[PDB]
Write a protein that binds this ligand. Structure first.
Ligand SMILES: [Ca+2]
Ligand SMILES: [Ca+2]
Ligand SMILES: [Zn+2]
Ligand SMILES: [Zn+2]
Length: 247
């Protein structure tokens, strides 16, 4: 909490490790000098300009929630594919949270997922009989998977990469707050575009107006939608397109 930067080694480790979990679990790189190199990468990935340092904006974000998905791969059980390679993608809800009835959760995922679908030539299909590729469920890290519950705050939602039928699923930290009309904690619409975006193998982006922006913050937009730099990125791989925007 601000002083994390100049805290004792034990508390300080939490800061260094908070970035580390958001990337991967590699005990080799754990080091006090190596710290400085890896931070360089955090700053480009995040976008923030201040670099080689941490305490003010860098920490402000570690403590602030964002996402629970790693951003890299190394010694783990996952396939190698940048995006979905299936002919069609599908999605179904497993369970629902008391904050929102089942229909509401469901229509939010479609209202976000579809929004991605329109920005790409992939073909998406609605579910009415049987299981689907992407399962959307509420659960805690102790449901039977890696990534722990870590309580509310830090770590917002883990999700999986488009891998096989089982992999590709999306999840929501049930501990976290979830709503839409109340507009109090995390809007489902907003996180859904992010969580579902990770089910497409999209990586984060640095623009401050990005949809996967890892620096959660910004004001309260009117309707809100896919961003410019985020769209061109996915298009460059599914086809060919370019663009530029800042602020
Ligand atoms: Ca959490
Ligand atoms: Ca899946
Ligand atoms: Zn993310
Ligand atoms: Zn899980």
């Amino acid at each position: 909490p601000q002083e994390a930067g100049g805290m004792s080694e034990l508390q300080w480790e939490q800061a260094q490790d908070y970035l580390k979990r958001f990337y991967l679990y590699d005990s080799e790189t754990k080091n006090a000098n190596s710290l400085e190199a890896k931070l360089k990468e955090m700053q480009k990935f995040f976008g923030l300009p201040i670099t080689g340092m941490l305490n003010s904006r860098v920490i402000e974000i570690m403590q602030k929630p964002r996402c629970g998905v790693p951003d890299v791969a190394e010694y783990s059980l996952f396939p190698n594919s940048p995006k979905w390679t299936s002919k069609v993608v599908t999605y179904r809800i497993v369970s629902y949270t008391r904050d929102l009835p089942h229909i509401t959760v469901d229509r939010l995922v479609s209202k976000a997922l579809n929004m991605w679908g329109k920005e790409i030539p992939l073909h998406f299909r609605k579910v009415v009989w049987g299981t689907a590729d992407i399962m959307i469920g509420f659960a805690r890290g102790a449901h039977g998977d890696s990534y722990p519950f870590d309580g509310p705050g830090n770590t917002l939602a883990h999700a999986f990469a488009p891998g096989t039928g089982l992999g590709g699923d999306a999840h929501f930290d049930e501990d976290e707050r979830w709503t839409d009309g109340s507009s109090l904690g995390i809007n489902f619409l907003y996180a859904a575009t992010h969580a579902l975006g990770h089910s497409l193998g999209m990586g984060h982006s640095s623009d401050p107006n990005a949809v996967m922006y890892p620096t959660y913050g910004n004001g309260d937009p009117q309707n809100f939608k896919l961003s410019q730099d985020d769209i061109k990125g996915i298009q460059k791989l599914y086809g060919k397109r370019s663009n530029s925007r800042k602020k």
